[PDB]
RNA sequence: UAGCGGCGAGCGAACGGGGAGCAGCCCAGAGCCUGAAUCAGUGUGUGUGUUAGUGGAAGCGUCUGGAAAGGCGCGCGAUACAGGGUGACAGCCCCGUACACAAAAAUGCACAUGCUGUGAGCUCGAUGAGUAGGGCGGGACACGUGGUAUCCUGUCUGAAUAUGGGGGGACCAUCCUCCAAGGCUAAAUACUCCUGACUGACCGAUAGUGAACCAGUACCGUGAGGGAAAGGCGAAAAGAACCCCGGCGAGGGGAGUGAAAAAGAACCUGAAACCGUGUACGUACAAGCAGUGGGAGCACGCUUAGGCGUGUGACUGCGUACCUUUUGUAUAAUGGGUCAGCGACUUAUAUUCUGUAGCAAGGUUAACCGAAUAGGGGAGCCGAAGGGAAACCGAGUCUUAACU
């Protein structure tokens, strides 16, 4: 029987229709109020416009720059470190396992999660905690 | 279409770990001779955005 | 999916005009005038379901005053005597006794007087 | 799971997680609604205020006359052309998660098996494409309205009862939840059941 | 996103990755070698379309009915139950549909081949100057002259010639990579005046195209130009012979046709405002949003009630419309002559939150392919780690010579 399936309770609701009678609760002016710019079609002030007063994003100064090198430097999580699927942990091996990003030239091993495989790491910088974890798990780092 | 961020606010605010925003204090650009060293030292660090301004900051920065 | 209205709009107007029967002039012919007549009729009906109690109580009180003064006592003293007569519980609406059975009403008056005396 | 064969009174083994499990009514309802919306095409109409034949000339001057304020012959308020919120052709297809589709299908199959609307046989074909043969066989099997799915891709069977409305025949790969829920009873063929199991599961 | 920007409003890439599609060749010159490739333009042969077409299965009885296709009973076809018509809804009444066939004559698209023009390949050469670049003024590159690379040129100038020259975002050196100032080139891509078939949770005569109808018409304007209204008898005209009143009128009453004439041309259905005829009650000494509560009498259908219901409403208490805008409106503030029809919070794409469903440190695909709502595709995107302007460090990091 096809005419037997029904949606889960609370999964669907009608919503609201403005300007349909008094009983609906949104008649006449539908959630608009009386007069003013907030009413009317296409009304309302632009984004971040707090009146004619100088806005927050303009009364505060600028600072900093973009390194152009942080965008080419990833960090690998010590948790998995297994998607390499055998062999050593290399930059190209990480790229092959979709864990780093093709347009990446520097990676950090970091201490996050846990590792148990004794696989080694080559040509990657390792934090002190990550190094300790790898050596405890029986790995090796290409000093 | 995509929402276009306010580039003026993108270089004014930066997002923090718990969703807050950090910004640089004002009154530290010029005419600094008559300002107290205590005042300038307290202004030198960076502060967080207040409760009332978070709505405007988030509206300006949708992709931050 | 274009909705053509018509049938339901006619049904609502028919309902209102059916309720607006018996009214003079356009109040029973024109929907715009008739609709205002029905709402005012409802308002007046609501207010008078309340005013009815007051009107009938007033009529009963005047009635009891007339009968009690016929028997030789005012309404206030008659009510006070009935109240004091061993908390005798009788009724303002039951003042149809004063219309139908006169001897019963004078019997009531006799012990109202006795209680006051 | 064990499915009792019909033609040979034998038994066959199938995956429990596939052919038996709780029936997720909300999930199957979402998938069915999405499938129904998939067929729904657009092709709408109602040229709007701008693209209505006419002129930009103002019907009459702003002031000095007792008439209301008019600015265009194409106004939506006027008896002439003009529709406030016109309709453009649009797509109604939904996304439906890939795992959600398989889950809904598994639930449908489990419900069919549990309600005994699913039958399984070894072979099912007609030696000739005559509709009479298929009608006679279905009458003998007592199947007034049925969906038949196989993996053989038999053109003779396809031709037989090609337009017979109560009977539908389709390949094991072209199964859909709407057909599975619509047809009164479903008839499989050993090979088909394997192919589904190896797919759905 | 990087950037540009009265660094305001706003504008907005590229590198790189995944796909659709796959095609490379000539001149700046003659020696050989050859007439050789691959093309264009024309004949013939073969194949397949187009421009008329042919065949194309299977039902009877009975009831209601004006009429059977409907109900009841019993049969047959189906590679044909797409669709339309026929006196109400037909697989088997008709046209068709599935399927299988068909061209005298003229043409399209691919192949083979005859012939005309162009030519093949090898060695050796050559290698686009008022050009590149530059000064001045502009324009285009996401890039508004800014520290501004690169492209084009109105004006004035002006190189080198494989040992040479251009680029790599001011500029110099090293390195890498290409070879301007001569040309041609299919596919993937854009669109529909027009032709055929099919489709629609598109409209159904104030809708849909302006125009379902002899519509770009009537009509308006000197002209450019603007621009309507207007669909439906019945199955079949069987469209009312004949008689009567009437001006040998208009109009009507009979008769007749028809299932229906109250389907009669101004013809399906026939609502509302608005205007009439008849019946019941009230109304000519009574003052106002015309109702509402009480309520006599009168007139009509019933009852085991008489005083139950319906119509009217003498008399009587209370009672100054609606909407909008306002501190506040009976207000003498705005709007509405009335009826019918139409008429105003929508759609697309992004982003945040709530509910609900799937999956669970993972979730999910986009284009595209596809036996096309399946399956493949993980390019990507979000999350699991933050601090700092950044290098950088990292469950820590920043500040500071360093922090309790
Ligand atoms: Mg409210
Ligand atoms: Mg208003
Ligand atoms: Mg105001
Ligand atoms: Mg307001
Ligand atoms: Mg507007
Ligand atoms: Mg100002
Ligand atoms: Mg990736
Ligand atoms: Mg400074
Ligand atoms: Mg409709
Ligand atoms: Mg009436
Ligand atoms: Mg229109
Ligand atoms: Mg898919
Ligand atoms: Mg024929
Ligand atoms: Mg035939
Ligand atoms: Mg019959
Ligand atoms: Mg009929
Ligand atoms: Mg130049
Ligand atoms: Mg220059
Ligand atoms: Mg140059
Ligand atoms: Mg350069
Ligand atoms: Mg450089
Ligand atoms: Mg050159
Ligand atoms: Mg029209
Ligand atoms: Mg009509
Ligand atoms: Mg004229
Ligand atoms: Mg006549
Ligand atoms: Mg009809
Ligand atoms: Mg009529
Ligand atoms: Mg009428
Ligand atoms: Mg008098
Ligand atoms: Mg009188
Ligand atoms: Mg008067
Ligand atoms: Mg009064
Ligand atoms: Mg005022
Ligand atoms: Mg007042
Ligand atoms: Mg006043
Ligand atoms: Mg007024
Ligand atoms: Mg006004
Ligand atoms: Mg007025
Ligand atoms: Mg970080």
Tell me how far CA of residue A119 lies from CA of A11, A93, D119, in angstroms: 49, 13, 53
Domain count, chain B: 1
Q: How was this entry determined?
A: cryo-EM
Contact D20, D113 (CB under 8 A): yes
**Is A67 marked as a binding-site residue?**
no
- Chains with 3 or more CB pairs under 8 A to chain C: none
A75: CA distance to ligand 40 center in Å?
Answer: 9
Residue B24: nearest nucleotide (C-alpha to C1'): E389
Centre a 10 Å sphere on the Cβ of residue A91 and count the other Cβ atoms it contains: 17
Beta strands of chain B (E only): which ranges?
14-15, 21-24, 46-48
Q: At what angle do helices C31-71 and C75-84 cross, to 10 degrees?
A: 70
Measured between alpha carbons, how far is A28 from D147 in angstroms, rounded to an integer?
Answer: 54
Contact A63, B24 (CB under 8 A): yes
Exposure b/e, A10-34, CB count within 10 A at least 16 = b: eeeeeeeeeeeeeeeeeeeeeeeee
Handedness of CA D141, D146, D150, D153 (dihedral sign): positive
Pairing of strands B21-24, D167-171: unpaired
Contact B63, B3 (CB under 8 A): yes
Which single residue is written with the structure tokens 């060293």?
B37
* Nearest neighbour of D181 by CB, restricted to A2, A8, A11: A2
Burial of B4 (C-beta count, 10 Å sphere; 0-12/13-18/19+): exposed
Beta bridge partners of D150: D171
- In three-state secondary structure terms, D171 is strand
Handedness of CA D118, D120, D126, D132 (dihedral sign): negative
Alpha carbons within 13 A on the beta-carbon side of D196? 26
φ, ψ of residue A125 in degrees (nearest 5): -80, 140
A10 near D CB under 8 A = no
CA-CA-CA-CA dihedral for D47, D52, D53, D56, to nearest 10: -170
- In three-state secondary structure terms, A10 is coil
φ, ψ of residue A106 in degrees (nearest 5): -140, 140
| B20 contact partners, CB below 8 Å, separation of at least 6 | B48, B49, B54
Resolution of the experimentally solved model in angstroms: 2.6
User: How many angstroms separate the CA of C97 from the C1' of E158?
Assistant: 136
| A47 contact partners, CB below 8 Å, separation of at least 6 | B6, B59, B60
Contact C75, C64 (CB under 8 A): yes
- In three-state secondary structure terms, A108 is strand
Measured between alpha carbons, how far is A120 from C88 in angstroms, rounded to an integer?
Answer: 108
A64:B14 CB<8 A: yes
DSSP, res A97: T
Q: At what angle do helices C7-19 and C31-71 cross, to 10 degrees?
A: 30
Pairing of strands A73-75, D11-13: unpaired
CA-CA-CA-CA dihedral for D77, D82, D87, D88, to nearest 10: -150
The whole domain housing B5 covers: 1-64
Measured between alpha carbons, how far is D24 from B43 in angstroms, rounded to an integer?
Answer: 60
Pair of tokens at residue A80 = 């998995």
**Is A92 marked as a binding-site residue?**
no
A61:B12 CB<8 A: yes
D31 near A CB under 8 A = no
DSSP, res D167: E
Q: Report the largest interatomic distance among the alpha carbons of chain B, rounded to a whole angstrom.
A: 50
Which single residue is written with the structure tokens 């396809």?
D158
Contact B12, A60 (CB under 8 A): yes
End-to-end CA distance of chain D: 13
Chain B meets chain C (3+ C-beta pairs below 8 A): no
Task: Express the helix, strand and coil content of chain C in percent, nearest 5 each.
Answer: 80, 0, 20
The whole domain housing D170 covers: 2-200
Measured between alpha carbons, how far is C94 from C113 in angstroms, rounded to an integer?
Answer: 19
User: How many angstroms separate the CA of A101 from the C1' of E175?
Assistant: 29
Measured between alpha carbons, how far is D54 from D68 in angstroms, rounded to an integer?
Answer: 20
CB within 7 A of strand E (chain D, 102-121): 102-103
Domain CATH number, residue D19: 3.40.1370.10
Residues in chain B with CB shorter than 8 Å from the CB of A44 are: none
Pair of tokens at residue B52 = 């009332």
Where do the structural domains in chain A lie, given as residue ranges?
Answer: 1-143
Pair of tokens at residue D189 = 């063929």
DSSP string, A26-54: --SS-S--SSSSSSSTT-S--TT--TTSP
For strand E, the positions having any atom within 7 A of a protein Cβ are 1-5, 7-12, 15-17, 77-82, 199-210, 216, 225-228, 271-274, 289-294, 311-313, 317-318, 321-322, 324-326, 336, 338-351, 355-359, 361-366, 371-380, 384-396
C37: CA distance to ligand 17 center in Å?
Answer: 90
Pair of tokens at residue D107 = 């639930």
DSSP, res A11: S
Does an H or E element contain C55, and which? Answer: helix C31-71
DSSP string, D15-82: -HHHHSS---HHHHHHHHHHHHHHH---------STTSSS----SS-SSSSSSPP---TT-TTSSSS-
Domain count, chain D: 1
For chain A, the C-alpha Rg in angstroms (whole number) is 29
What contacts 24+ positions apart, CB below 8 Å, involve A130-136? A130/A78, A133/A78, A134/A78, A134/A109
């Amino acid at each position: 029987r096809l005419n037997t399936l029904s949606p889960a309770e609370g999964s669907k609701k009608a919503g609201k229709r403005l300007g349909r009678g008094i009983g609906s609760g949104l008649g006449k002016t539908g959630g608009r109020g009386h007069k003013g710019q907030k009413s009317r079609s296409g009304g309302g002030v632009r984004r971040g416009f707090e009146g004619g007063q100088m806005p927050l994003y303009r009364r505060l100064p600028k600072f900093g720059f973009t390194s152009r090198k942080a965008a080419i430097t990833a960090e690998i999580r010590l948790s998995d470190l297994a998607k390499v699927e055998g062999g050593v942990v290399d930059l190209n091996t990480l790229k092959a396992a979709n864990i780093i990003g093709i347009q990446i030239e520097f990676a950090k091993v970091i201490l996050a999660g846990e590792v148990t495989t004794p696989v080694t790491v080559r040509g990657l910088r390792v934090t002190k905690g990550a190094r300790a974890a790898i050596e405890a798990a029986g790995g090796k780092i290409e000093e | 279409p995509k929402i276009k961020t306010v580039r003026g606010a993108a270089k004014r605010f930066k997002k923090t770990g718990k969703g807050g925003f950090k910004h640089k204090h004002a009154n530290l650009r010029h005419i600094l001779t008559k300002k107290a060293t205590k005042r300038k030292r307290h202004l030198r660090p960076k502060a967080m955005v207040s409760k009332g301004d978070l709505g405007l900051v988030i509206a300006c920065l949708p992709y931050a | 999916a274009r909705v053509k209205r018509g049938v339901i709009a006619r049904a609502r107007h028919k309902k209102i005009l059916k309720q607006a029967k018996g009214y003079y002039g356009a109040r029973s012919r024109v929907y715009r005038v008739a609709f205002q007549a029905v709402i005012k009729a409802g308002q007046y009906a609501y207010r008078d379901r309340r005013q009815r109690k007051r009107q009938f109580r007033q009529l009963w009180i005047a009635r009891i005053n007339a009968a009690a003064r016929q028997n030789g006592i005012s309404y206030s003293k008659f009510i006070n005597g009935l109240k004091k007569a061993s908390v005798e519980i009788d009724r303002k609406i039951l003042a149809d006794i004063a219309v139908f059975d006169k001897v019963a009403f004078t019997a009531l008056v006799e012990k109202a007087k006795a209680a006051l005396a | 799971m064990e499915l009792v064969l019909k033609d040979a009174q034998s038994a066959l083994t199938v995956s429990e997680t596939t052919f038996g499990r709780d029936f997720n009514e909300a999930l199957v309802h979402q998938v069915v609604v999405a499938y129904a919306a998939g067929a729904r095409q657009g092709t709408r109409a109602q040229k709007t205020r701008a693209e209505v034949t006419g002129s930009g000339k103002k019907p009459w001057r702003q002031k000095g006359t007792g008439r209301a304020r008019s600015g265009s012959i194409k106004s939506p308020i006027w008896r002439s052309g003009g529709v406030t919120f016109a309709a453009r052709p649009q797509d109604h297809s939904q996304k439906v998660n890939k795992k959600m589709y398989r889950g809904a299908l598994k639930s449908i199959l489990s419900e069919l098996v549990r309600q005994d609307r699913l039958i399984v046989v070894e072979k099912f074909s007609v030696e000739a494409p005559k509709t009479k043969l298929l009608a006679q066989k279905l009458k003998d099997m007592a199947l007034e309205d049925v969906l038949i799915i196989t993996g053989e891709l038999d053109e003779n069977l396809f031709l037989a009862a090609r337009n017979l409305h109560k009977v539908d025949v389709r390949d094991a790969t072209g199964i859909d939840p709407v057909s599975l829920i619509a047809f009164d009873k479903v008839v499989m063929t050993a090979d088909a059941v394997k192919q589904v199991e190896e797919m759905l599961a």
